[PDB]
Design a protein around this motif. Structure first.
Motif, PDB file in Angstrom:
ATOM      1  N   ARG A   1     -12.717   4.024  -0.430  1.00 59.55           N
ATOM      2  CA  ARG A   1     -12.002   2.438  -0.259  1.00 59.55           C
ATOM      3  C   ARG A   1     -12.942   2.247  -0.156  1.00 59.55           C
ATOM      4  O   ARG A   1     -13.932   1.050  -0.592  1.00 59.55           O
ATOM      5  CB  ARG A   1     -10.387   1.749   0.536  1.00 59.55           C
ATOM      6  CG  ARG A   1      -9.345   2.330  -0.162  1.00 59.55           C
ATOM      7  CD  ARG A   1      -8.492   2.177   0.249  1.00 59.55           C
ATOM      8  NE  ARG A   1      -6.501   2.417  -0.802  1.00 59.55           N
ATOM      9  CZ  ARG A   1      -5.882   2.617  -0.165  1.00 59.55           C
ATOM     10  NH1 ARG A   1      -5.809   1.317   1.168  1.00 59.55           N
ATOM     11  NH2 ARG A   1      -5.251   3.153  -0.379  1.00 59.55           N
TER      12      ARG A   1
ATOM     13  N   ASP B   1       0.847  -1.352  -0.178  1.00 59.68           N
ATOM     14  CA  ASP B   1      -0.008  -0.416   0.034  1.00 59.68           C
ATOM     15  C   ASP B   1       0.908   1.257   0.165  1.00 59.68           C
ATOM     16  O   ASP B   1       0.984   1.855   1.065  1.00 59.68           O
ATOM     17  CB  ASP B   1      -0.652  -0.187   1.217  1.00 59.68           C
ATOM     18  CG  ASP B   1      -2.021   1.170   0.951  1.00 59.68           C
ATOM     19  OD1 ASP B   1      -2.066   1.642  -0.028  1.00 59.68           O
ATOM     20  OD2 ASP B   1      -3.337   0.482   0.695  1.00 59.68           O
TER      21      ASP B   1
ATOM     22  N   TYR C   1      -2.305  14.666   7.896  1.00 54.92           N
ATOM     23  CA  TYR C   1      -1.416  13.354   7.148  1.00 54.92           C
ATOM     24  C   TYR C   1      -2.522  12.352   7.532  1.00 54.92           C
ATOM     25  O   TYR C   1      -3.095  10.311   6.720  1.00 54.92           O
ATOM     26  CB  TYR C   1      -0.622  13.233   7.723  1.00 54.92           C
ATOM     27  CG  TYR C   1       0.405  14.476   7.521  1.00 54.92           C
ATOM     28  CD1 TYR C   1       1.448  14.442   8.413  1.00 54.92           C
ATOM     29  CD2 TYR C   1       0.964  14.954   5.738  1.00 54.92           C
ATOM     30  CE1 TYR C   1       2.402  16.087   7.544  1.00 54.92           C
ATOM     31  CE2 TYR C   1       1.582  15.344   5.777  1.00 54.92           C
ATOM     32  CZ  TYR C   1       2.638  16.039   6.207  1.00 54.92           C
ATOM     33  OH  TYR C   1       2.900  17.331   5.832  1.00 54.92           O
TER      34      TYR C   1
ATOM     35  N   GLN D   1      -0.050   4.118  -0.987  1.00 51.46           N
ATOM     36  CA  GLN D   1      -0.069   5.330  -0.597  1.00 51.46           C
ATOM     37  C   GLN D   1      -0.678   5.707   1.363  1.00 51.46           C
ATOM     38  O   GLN D   1      -0.316   6.815   2.018  1.00 51.46           O
ATOM     39  CB  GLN D   1      -2.106   5.847  -1.192  1.00 51.46           C
ATOM     40  CG  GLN D   1      -2.182   6.044  -2.419  1.00 51.46           C
ATOM     41  CD  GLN D   1      -3.379   6.365  -2.673  1.00 51.46           C
ATOM     42  OE1 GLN D   1      -4.644   4.957  -2.529  1.00 51.46           O
ATOM     43  NE2 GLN D   1      -4.012   7.421  -3.281  1.00 51.46           N
ATOM     44  N   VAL D   2      -0.915   4.666   1.704  1.00 53.89           N
ATOM     45  CA  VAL D   2      -0.737   4.165   3.216  1.00 53.89           C
ATOM     46  C   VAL D   2       0.369   4.954   3.814  1.00 53.89           C
ATOM     47  O   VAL D   2       0.638   5.589   4.315  1.00 53.89           O
ATOM     48  CB  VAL D   2      -1.532   3.472   3.322  1.00 53.89           C
ATOM     49  CG1 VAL D   2      -1.668   3.110   5.576  1.00 53.89           C
ATOM     50  CG2 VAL D   2      -3.733   3.217   3.378  1.00 53.89           C
TER      51      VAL D   2
ATOM     52  N   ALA E   1      -8.075   1.065   6.347  1.00 56.03           N
ATOM     53  CA  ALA E   1      -7.366   1.066   4.834  1.00 56.03           C
ATOM     54  C   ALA E   1      -6.779   0.519   3.641  1.00 56.03           C
ATOM     55  O   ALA E   1      -7.265  -0.042   2.742  1.00 56.03           O
ATOM     56  CB  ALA E   1      -6.851   2.608   4.976  1.00 56.03           C
ATOM     57  N   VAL E   2      -6.107  -0.925   4.892  1.00 52.18           N
ATOM     58  CA  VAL E   2      -5.275  -1.315   3.986  1.00 52.18           C
ATOM     59  C   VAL E   2      -6.368  -2.512   3.436  1.00 52.18           C
ATOM     60  O   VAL E   2      -5.765  -3.490   2.551  1.00 52.18           O
ATOM     61  CB  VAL E   2      -3.575  -1.744   4.781  1.00 52.18           C
ATOM     62  CG1 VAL E   2      -2.456  -3.468   3.980  1.00 52.18           C
ATOM     63  CG2 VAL E   2      -2.723  -0.241   5.361  1.00 52.18           C
TER      64      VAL E   2
ATOM     65  N   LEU F   1      -8.277   8.291   3.249  1.00 51.15           N
ATOM     66  CA  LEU F   1      -8.233   6.496   1.673  1.00 51.15           C
ATOM     67  C   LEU F   1      -9.575   5.237   2.273  1.00 51.15           C
ATOM     68  O   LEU F   1     -10.176   4.592   1.724  1.00 51.15           O
ATOM     69  CB  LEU F   1      -6.890   6.019   2.225  1.00 51.15           C
ATOM     70  CG  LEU F   1      -5.839   6.990   1.496  1.00 51.15           C
ATOM     71  CD1 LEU F   1      -4.642   6.726   1.473  1.00 51.15           C
ATOM     72  CD2 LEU F   1      -5.855   6.441   0.094  1.00 51.15           C
TER      73      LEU F   1
ATOM     74  N   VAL G   1       3.218   4.673  14.191  1.00 55.91           N
ATOM     75  CA  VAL G   1       3.134   6.071  15.373  1.00 55.91           C
ATOM     76  C   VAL G   1       1.740   7.118  14.678  1.00 55.91           C
ATOM     77  O   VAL G   1       2.045   7.268  15.884  1.00 55.91           O
ATOM     78  CB  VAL G   1       4.571   7.299  15.070  1.00 55.91           C
ATOM     79  CG1 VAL G   1       6.103   6.412  14.635  1.00 55.91           C
ATOM     80  CG2 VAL G   1       4.334   7.707  13.435  1.00 55.91           C
ATOM     81  N   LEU G   2       0.906   6.459  14.108  1.00 57.13           N
ATOM     82  CA  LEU G   2      -0.595   6.713  13.970  1.00 57.13           C
ATOM     83  C   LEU G   2      -1.197   6.828  15.878  1.00 57.13           C
ATOM     84  O   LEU G   2      -2.008   7.934  16.269  1.00 57.13           O
ATOM     85  CB  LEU G   2      -0.956   6.289  12.540  1.00 57.13           C
ATOM     86  CG  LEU G   2      -0.920   7.537  11.514  1.00 57.13           C
ATOM     87  CD1 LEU G   2       0.683   7.098  10.905  1.00 57.13           C
ATOM     88  CD2 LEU G   2      -1.640   6.327  10.467  1.00 57.13           C
TER      89      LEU G   2
ATOM     90  N   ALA H   1       1.957   8.739   3.434  1.00 58.27           N
ATOM     91  CA  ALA H   1       0.974   9.236   4.854  1.00 58.27           C
ATOM     92  C   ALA H   1       1.858   8.754   6.223  1.00 58.27           C
ATOM     93  O   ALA H   1       1.549   9.868   6.888  1.00 58.27           O
ATOM     94  CB  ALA H   1      -0.582   9.009   4.574  1.00 58.27           C
ATOM     95  N   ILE H   2       1.680   7.531   6.027  1.00 56.07           N
ATOM     96  CA  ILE H   2       2.542   7.124   7.348  1.00 56.07           C
ATOM     97  C   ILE H   2       3.185   8.184   7.726  1.00 56.07           C
ATOM     98  O   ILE H   2       4.171   8.344   8.631  1.00 56.07           O
ATOM     99  CB  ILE H   2       2.407   5.889   7.629  1.00 56.07           C
ATOM    100  CG1 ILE H   2       1.242   5.304   8.030  1.00 56.07           C
ATOM    101  CG2 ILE H   2       3.173   5.188   8.886  1.00 56.07           C
ATOM    102  CD1 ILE H   2       0.956   3.502   8.160  1.00 56.07           C
TER     103      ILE H   2
ATOM    104  N   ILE I   1      -5.259  11.748   5.682  1.00 56.77           N
ATOM    105  CA  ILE I   1      -5.129  11.158   3.843  1.00 56.77           C
ATOM    106  C   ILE I   1      -5.512   9.897   4.247  1.00 56.77           C
ATOM    107  O   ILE I   1      -6.225   9.504   3.780  1.00 56.77           O
ATOM    108  CB  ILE I   1      -3.395  11.281   3.514  1.00 56.77           C
ATOM    109  CG1 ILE I   1      -3.364  13.240   2.820  1.00 56.77           C
ATOM    110  CG2 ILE I   1      -3.438  10.751   2.405  1.00 56.77           C
ATOM    111  CD1 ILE I   1      -1.678  13.189   2.984  1.00 56.77           C
ATOM    112  N   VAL I   2      -5.198   9.378   5.478  1.00 56.73           N
ATOM    113  CA  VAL I   2      -4.962   7.486   6.091  1.00 56.73           C
ATOM    114  C   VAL I   2      -7.005   7.579   6.286  1.00 56.73           C
ATOM    115  O   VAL I   2      -6.805   6.477   5.370  1.00 56.73           O
ATOM    116  CB  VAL I   2      -4.262   7.451   7.215  1.00 56.73           C
ATOM    117  CG1 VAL I   2      -4.776   6.195   7.731  1.00 56.73           C
ATOM    118  CG2 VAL I   2      -3.109   6.935   6.580  1.00 56.73           C
TER     119      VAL I   2
END
Lengths: 405, 405
Positions: free
Chosen positions: B77, A8, B66, A10-11, B267-268, B73, B46-47, A14-15, B69-70
């Motif tokens: 999706r 992924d 950021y 995209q993910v 998201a993943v 996503l 780290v999120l 962003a992380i 964005i996650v």
């Protein structure tokens, strides 16, 4: 990371932005911290695959022998940390921990007394747009208009007038020590249960830098992710007499399957909190907050309550004729992360505010000390006294960059 | 793992036991699956450090660019996957997703019609020991005593008699396709909202192997961790007209800060579900369940409803004069993980039961196919027909070991 970058893009991108942001910015959000790599590895474990409804040795599914070991580790380390008779480590969040205690002792429409939200109380302590204020009849006690310290005579008067079934002590934006002994005395006078939500101060309690609510409260709720420096989630501590009811409130009452990987991470964080260096860390948090408070006052800022006893401070921006919203925005421009926050008796709406809330837990974790506190205060002074000067903001920008390397 | 083994030997040893257990056992718990290494890495990110109360582009704190964005996503999706007008990816769990929908459209004491818990309904669909049954007035519809298929005339009669504000369709132990069109027709007749809880079948819906509830339901709730093969958590899908109310129900209504690392993992998982191979996987899940059903029937077992349309099957153990409890225990002895489960019109308590629930999602993920299904059925036959023979159980033990390598 090995597999996420390929699976992924995209993910992952962003992380990585978020990871770099966390390093570059000066993080002063009072509720935030940085967890250890060990805590994160536990969260990234295969334990996410396991349904474990129920409790250790009393599950509603087989094959839990090992997740049982993990949950018991979390419960026992929590009991060692806080001296509680019982721990429930399954709450998904602070919200759900509070929800479960309310579910345990209250019926729909019961009266509850909590801290005025605009004086420091949390959303889950009776906000009319939150389940707490919709489901129960919340009344509020306030702080003194001058000292900004909880008015315990007001707590007593409100309790005697409204006759709550439950009293809630604790806050999201209260910079002084809370007198749990006085709360319990008032609770006893009116025949109410006492709940203490220590979410913000839990790490300080664990290190003996804030009085422990456990001996005074029937129920203690907390998040694991603030000063306790653990994963994102909740916990309930209580007297053994309520253990059975509290456990049933979490499941089958308000939740389903627990997050066993997060519970693993909770155990790790509790293990870390038990160590001597966490106590030293916690002292530096409080030392840093007091230093930051003094340094801000030296810059000409007025602080709610005149300083701090804990990890957090609230700047009253009225002398500077700024709103919290304006202050948050301009500090964001220079790389300093705060949140706008209502001050006691705020003339502004909670969407504008007259204050900013600042905490030191996060910067302390990264190794910031007293000299760094002085500099952070100086940068804040530079920015807020020169909101219209792009030159001053660029200098602030550079000085922030110098602090975070 | 690198840091956890050094920091916390106790937690690491237990996690490693769990990891090895997950490989050694035949996992037939219908609600379980195995997530990808990518999903776990997102959860281990780290999120976890970020407070992100609110929603993307509308947060109540800065520095969310950021994590926004996650979350977007994840939402986008999910909308692509299910064709929903709106997604909320913040629910901590299936329980909290259901809780938020109830919070949105119901007042305390409102009548709700859900599937009889002993016929396949979930705890959160009106159990008297769950918030749903305590907070709202739940009535139940049942399945036919012979076919074990939802009796849609009973759904209609109960709806017309009790006049619910909300109808709930979906189940934790229903092996046939649910007719969402009929549910909506009944809902329209009595002027009720329709909620579909697709937690179990969500992955099958995503792959076009179960009719999609989205076009028929006002609200669709789900977990992300069952057939959808994602991290542990919840999600709400709904029509744009309820988007604002649903979002406010999650926050500030029933939760606080979302788990941004889990949302990353969501998201993943959604990205994975969008791929062609997930659709092939999902077909194998259903193919495997039908094969397992047939193979069990060949061993002389009676199945609730006479087979399956989805990922799960329920064995009615009454012909063998065994309880679900006895069956679960003895299968645990040989390395097969099932759960005891009530059968429709069960003469036994839900703590004993006359059935076992089996699902194929987990074993399919590990690469099991039709030949492995035949063998699993044969082993189950060997064990349950010879509960008192340690020789038979040891042979079963060895054959289980042969399957898991």
């Amino acid at each position: 990371m090995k597999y996420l970058p390929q699976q992924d893009p995209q993910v992952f991108a962003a992380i990585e932005q978020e990871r770099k942001r966390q390093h570059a910015k000066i993080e002063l959000i009072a509720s935030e911290n940085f967890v250890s790599r060990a805590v994160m590895e536990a969260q990234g474990s295969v334990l996410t695959n396991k349904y474990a409804e129920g409790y250790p040795g009393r599950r509603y599914a087989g094959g839990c022998e090992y997740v049982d070991i993990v949950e018991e580790l979390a419960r026992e380390r929590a009991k060692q940390l806080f001296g509680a008779e019982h721990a429930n480590v399954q709450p998904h969040s602070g919200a759900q921990a509070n929800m479960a205690v309310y579910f345990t002792v209250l019926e729909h429409g019961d009266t509850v007394l909590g801290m005025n939200l605009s004086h420091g109380g949390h959303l889950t302590h009776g906000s009319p747009v939150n389940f707490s204020g919709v489901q129960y009849n919340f009344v509020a006690y306030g702080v003194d208009p001058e000292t900004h310290v909880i008015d315990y005579d007001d707590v007593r008067e409100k309790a005697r007038l409204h006759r709550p079934k439950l009293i809630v002590a604790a806050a999201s934006a209260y910079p002084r020590i809370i007198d749990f002994a006085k709360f319990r005395e008032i609770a006893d006078e009116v025949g109410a249960y006492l709940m203490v939500d220590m979410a913000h101060i839990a790490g300080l309690v664990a290190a003996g830098l804030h009085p422990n609510p456990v001996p005074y409260a029937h129920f203690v709720t907390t998040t694991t992710h603030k000063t306790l420096r653990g994963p994102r989630g909740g916990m309930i501590l209580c007297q053994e007499q309520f253990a059975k009811q509290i456990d049933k409130a979490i499941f089958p009452g308000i939740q389903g399957g627990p997050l066993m990987h997060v519970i693993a991470a909770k155990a790790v964080a509790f293990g870390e909190a038990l160590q001597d260096d966490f106590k030293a860390y916690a002292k530096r948090v409080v030392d840093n907050a007091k230093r930051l408070a003094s340094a801000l006052q030296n810059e000409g800022f007025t602080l709610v309550s005149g300083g701090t006893d804990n990890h957090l401070l609230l700047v009253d921006l009225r002398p500077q004729q700024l709103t919290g919203k304006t202050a948050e925005k301009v500090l964001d421009e220079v790389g300093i992360t705060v949140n706008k926050n209502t001050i006691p008796y705020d003339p502004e709406s909670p969407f504008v505010t007259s204050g900013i809330r600042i905490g030191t837990a996060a910067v302390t974790t990264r190794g910031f000390g007293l000299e760094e506190m002085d500099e952070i205060a100086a940068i804040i002074g530079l920015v807020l006294k020169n909101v219209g000067s792009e030159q001053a903001l660029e200098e602030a920008r550079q000085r922030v960059a110098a602090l975070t390397d």
